[PDB]
A and B are shown apart, each in its own frame.
Chain A
Amino acid sequence: DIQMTQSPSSLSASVGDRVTITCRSSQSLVHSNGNTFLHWYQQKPGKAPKLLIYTVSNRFSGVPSRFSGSGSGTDFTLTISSLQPEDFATYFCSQTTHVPWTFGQGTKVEIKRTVAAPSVFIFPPSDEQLKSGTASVVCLLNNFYPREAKVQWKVDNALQSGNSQESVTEQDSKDSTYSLSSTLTLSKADYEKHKVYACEVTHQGLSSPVTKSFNRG
């Protein structure tokens, strides 16, 4: 099998900057008929891979001109001449000169921007839910950068563990920010005991951890 060796693994760069990614083939990808069947893709979470460049350097119809492919033999480069917000994705190369087809390990590109603190929001459980006997509390961190933030869950000023889960969005096509939800799950039983529910959010863009809370009622 032809091994494709892609690098870097991860990068972060400012809007407008040149971004360079490498693929290497363990052997030549040149067919005897002259064509070199190496291709570049962009893949966004949850979507199919979008073709950027085919056969080394031919930019695909509709693809912006900031994407361009170069190289030959076993040595190829994908260049983004001027990174844009919408360009957040995993990029990866492909060889189809030989079966099996093989692929680079991908490069996760992320836009770097100025620091942005989250807006916080807490969401008491629905009464509809309470009928089922389960009680999901939700915290929402909105439009923050960078991706590193901590959610601390508190029940009567007493801190939690093992129970809550987290999710994070793709970087935003316009903002270049992230959003976080934090579902602290419980049972009706355990819920209606305690009184104060609170969300301590720690993030570099807040000078001092911010808290949002309700009381059941």
Chain B
Amino acid sequence: PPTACREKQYLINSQCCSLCQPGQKLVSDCTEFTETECLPCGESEFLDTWNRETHCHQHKYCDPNLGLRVQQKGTSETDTICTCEEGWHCTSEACESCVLHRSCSPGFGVKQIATGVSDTICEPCPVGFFSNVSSAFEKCHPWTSCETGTNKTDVVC
């Protein structure tokens, strides 16, 4: 008689039956003549795996206390996806907390602009280039060329 079953199946009455696909919950056991019966998850609810659950799960709320907001509302196969506010980024890919974007200080400039999921990279302004302000947007400006200066100040011709 059967011991294990394959993926997306479960053993019941000495026989393999189908698990319910993502998006649906178990409602009635299979028989020897009929396969497992399932029902799509209702509004606000979801199930993201092949499963034998009789109830779906509630969509997570995006915690405002961590500067978090709904980005994509949850489907029946997918949880709520959160993100941060304008001007903040998620600490991780998984977006568990929100942090203000780094400003590149005087003598530095943005090598990379801040995204919504990662942070500003800064570079020290090399020879030939300068910056005099802290900004999460602004890059290193080049020196006025002398066909009519520091990592901070513009040269005077």
Contacts and interface: CB of A to CB of B under 8 A. Distances in A.
| A contacts B directly (C-beta below 8 A) | yes
Interface of A: 31-33, 35, 37, 96-99
Given A35-B33, A96-B33, A99-B37, 18 more contacts: A31-B17, A31-B18, A31-B30, A31-B35, A32-B5, A32-B9, A32-B16, A32-B17, A32-B18, A32-B30, A32-B35, A33-B15, A33-B16, A97-B34, A97-B35, A98-B34, A98-B37, A99-B34
Contacts of B6: 32
Contacts of A33: 15-17, 32
Contacts of B37: 98-99
A155 B62 CA distance: 83
Contacts of B32: 33
Contacts of A96: 33-34
Contacts of A97: 34-35
Interface of B: 5-6, 9, 15-18, 30, 32-35, 37
Nearest to B32: A33
A33 B11 CA distance: 10
Contacts of B33: 35, 37, 96
Nearest to A29: B35
Nearest to A34: B16
14 contacts: A31-B30, A32-B5, A32-B9, A32-B30, A32-B35, A33-B15, A33-B16, A33-B17, A33-B32, A35-B33, A96-B33, A96-B34, A97-B34, A97-B35
A31 B37 CA distance: 12
A31 B30 CA distance: 10
Nearest to B10: A32
Nearest to A32: B16
Contacts of B18: 31-32
Contacts of A35: 33
A98 B17 CA distance: 12
Contacts of B30: 31-32
Nearest to B28: A99
A97 B5 CA distance: 18
A31 B32 CA distance: 9
Contacts of B34: 96-99
A112 B15 CA distance: 49
Nearest to B34: A99
Contacts of B16: 32-33
Nearest to B18: A32
A28 B5 CA distance: 18
B52 to A, nearest CB: 12
A97 B37 CA distance: 10
Contacts of A99: 34, 37
A99 B39 CA distance: 11
B49 to A, nearest CB: 17
B39 to A, nearest CB: 11
Contacts of A31: 17-18, 30, 35
A97 B32 CA distance: 10
A92 B118 CA distance: 58
B64 to A, nearest CB: 41
